[PDB]
Amino acid sequence: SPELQNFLTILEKEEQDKIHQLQKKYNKFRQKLEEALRES
Amino acid sequence: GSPELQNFLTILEKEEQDKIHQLQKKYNKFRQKLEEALRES
């Protein structure tokens, strides 16, 4: 049904947003750490 | 080099992947039960 499609896509967006923000947070930190280590 | 760095990062990677799997597990269950709840509504 339509309600099903609406609700499942809501859930998919919620899950994916949370996972991608974690991926971004870790990648930004690793990039910064690598950059800081190259200083010395 | 740098083994020191990589040893740290591998621990970080496991923490990250554990969090991601934990999220995936939760949302997979949520998906299942959401589908059930809708049918039975």
Curated annotation (Swiss-Prot), chain A:
Superkingdom assignment: Eukaryota
Localization: Cytoplasm; Cytoplasm, Cytoskeleton
Residues in SARAH domain copies: 2-40
Subunit structure as annotated in this protein's UniProt entry: Interacts directly with activated HRAS; a RASSF5-STK4/MST1 complex probably associates with activated HRAS. Interacts with KRAS. Probably interacts with Ras-like GTPases RRAS, MRAS, RAP1B, RAP2A and RALA. Interacts with RRAS2. Can self-associate. Interacts with RSSF1 isoform A. The RSSF1 isoform A-RSSF5 heterodimer probably mediates the association of RSSF1 with HRAS. Isoform 2 interacts with activated RAP1A and ITGAL/LFA-1. Binds STK4/MST1, inhibiting STK4/MST1 autoactivation.
Protein task: Potential tumor suppressor. Seems to be involved in lymphocyte adhesion by linking RAP1A activation upon T-cell receptor or chemokine stimulation to integrin activation. Isoform 2 stimulates lymphocyte polarization and the patch-like distribution of ITGAL/LFA-1, resulting in an enhanced adhesion to ICAM1. Together with RAP1A may participate in regulation of microtubule growth. The association of isoform 2 with activated RAP1A is required for directional movement of endothelial cells during wound healing. May be involved in regulation of Ras apoptotic function.
Protein name per its UniProtKB record: Ras association domain-containing protein 5
Source organism: Mus musculus (Mouse)
Residues of the full protein shown: 370 to 408 of 413
Curated annotation (Swiss-Prot), chain B:
UniProt subcellular location: Cytoplasm; Cytoplasm, Cytoskeleton
Domain called SARAH: residue spans: 3-41
Functional note: Potential tumor suppressor. Seems to be involved in lymphocyte adhesion by linking RAP1A activation upon T-cell receptor or chemokine stimulation to integrin activation. Isoform 2 stimulates lymphocyte polarization and the patch-like distribution of ITGAL/LFA-1, resulting in an enhanced adhesion to ICAM1. Together with RAP1A may participate in regulation of microtubule growth. The association of isoform 2 with activated RAP1A is required for directional movement of endothelial cells during wound healing. May be involved in regulation of Ras apoptotic function.
The protein's assembly and partners: Interacts directly with activated HRAS; a RASSF5-STK4/MST1 complex probably associates with activated HRAS. Interacts with KRAS. Probably interacts with Ras-like GTPases RRAS, MRAS, RAP1B, RAP2A and RALA. Interacts with RRAS2. Can self-associate. Interacts with RSSF1 isoform A. The RSSF1 isoform A-RSSF5 heterodimer probably mediates the association of RSSF1 with HRAS. Isoform 2 interacts with activated RAP1A and ITGAL/LFA-1. Binds STK4/MST1, inhibiting STK4/MST1 autoactivation.
Name the record gives this protein: Ras association domain-containing protein 5
Residues of the full protein shown: 370 to 408 of 413
